[PDB]
Each structure stands twice: as C-alpha cells, then as structure tokens.
Amino acid sequence: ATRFASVYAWNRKRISNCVADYSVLYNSASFSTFKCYGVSPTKLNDLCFTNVYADSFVIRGDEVRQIAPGQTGKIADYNYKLPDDFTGCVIAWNSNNL
Amino acid sequence: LSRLDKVEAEVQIDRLITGRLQSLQTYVTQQLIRAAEIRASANLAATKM
Amino acid sequence: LSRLDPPEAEVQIDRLITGRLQSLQTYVTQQLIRAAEIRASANLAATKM
Amino acid sequence: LSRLDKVEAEVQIDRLITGRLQSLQTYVTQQLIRAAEIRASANLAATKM
C-alpha cells in the first residue's frame, strides 16, 4: 500500500472468505523478522481459519522489542496492546524508502 | 501438533503429560485402596459363607 | 502481587500452585491409608463388641 | 553439574527432582498399601495361632 496508518490511529482491515497463501509471504526474503506466537511459523498452511484481521501501522525500530504480547513499554501501555493469550504473527521489516 | 514445531510443542505437551499422568496415578491409588477395602469385605463374606 | 509483573508473575505462581497441590496429595493419601486402617481395626472392634 | 553454570542447570535439576521424588512417593504408596495387606494378613495368622 501507498500510505499506512499511525501507531496513534491504526488500520483494521477485516478479512474473510478468501483462500490464503502464507507461504509466498514466508519464502520471500523481504522481511527483518517473522515471529508467529502460538502457531508454528511454517505450519501456517495447514490450519483453516475463521477470521483474519490485518492490522498495519509504523513504529520506532527499537519498539519491536515492545511489540511482543505481555511485554511492557510505552507503546504497550499507552498506544497498542496485545493480550497475554494472543495467537498469530507479527511481522516487521525495515522502511528506509517505504 | 497441528500448530507448532518441535522445540515448543514438546514444552506444551510436557505440561500436559505432567498432569494427565498425575490424574492416572491418582486414579490408580484410589482404586488400590478401594480394592483393599473390597478384599476385607470379601474375606468377611467368605468367612460368613 | 506486590512487586512482580502480572503478564509474567503467573509463571512464579505456576510452580507455586503445583508444589502446594503436590503437598496436598500427600495429605490425601496419608489420611486415606490410615482411614482404611482404622476402619478395618474398627470393624474388628465392633466385632469385639 | 560439569558442563553448565548455575542458572541454566537449575532448570535442568528442577526437572530432575520432580519425577525422582515422584517415583519415591510412588514407591512409598506401593509399599504402604501392600503393608496394609500384610497387616491384614498378620492378624488373620495370629488369630489362627
């Protein structure tokens, strides 16, 4: 996408009723990190799902240490919060022209 | 098994093992004591017979 | 609950639940074995009555 | 004890205690119930004496 949303006001794209393809997001080497919590990161293909929420924003680069669920931090207690029993994947990659 | 690789699936499973095994061992102990009681009753019944 | 972090303090609680429950199972069996041992003695006692 | 430091082996020794101690408690429980059977055996014997 051209422009994203802020960490202040973020964007929620509800995704249903389509055939996913996570492997093409997996094998493509354009990512700084790929951390799937609760689900094994290469087993994304075999489990079939109810609802998908695509949540995109931007952040200070050291605050990917604070994007983890349960981890405290000034983004975590003020701006964007995950539950302790969160499952899913957070993906972050660098943005120097993006 | 359908959602994790080895090193963490083993952990979660191990959490299940210590506790399903505990349940089984509790059941065994209860049944053993109950059986000993039943034995006492049976020896009494044989004595009466 | 004073000086820990509730997204992680349950891990310290996690073993704390077990060993207290592990101690409770010891009290379960220690009662139950003598309880059968009392009654089997007591059924003799009523038989001596 | 010979290949790890204090912190990481403490978790490994933690796993070693639960299970050795549990087998010991499993051993005690097997001994106690069987002892009551022996205890039930003995009073039958001395009455026949």
From Swiss-Prot, chain C:
Residues of the full protein shown: 981 to 1029 of 1273
Protein source organism: Severe acute respiratory syndrome coronavirus 2 (2019-nCoV)
Function of the molecule: Subunit of the fusion protein that is processed upon entry into the host cell. Mediates fusion of the virion and cellular membranes by functioning as a class I viral fusion protein. Contains a viral fusion peptide that is unmasked after S2 cleavage. This cleavage can occur at the cell membrane by host TMPRSS2 or during endocytosis by host CSTL. In either case, this triggers an extensive and irreversible conformational change that leads to fusion of the viral envelope with the cellular cytoplasmic membrane, releasing viral genomic RNA into the host cell cytoplasm.
Domain of life of the organism encoding this protein: Viruses
Annotated consequence of substituting S2A: In strain: Alpha/B.1.1.7
Underlying gene: S
Protein name, per record: Spike protein S2'
Effect of substituting T47I: In strain: Gamma/P.1
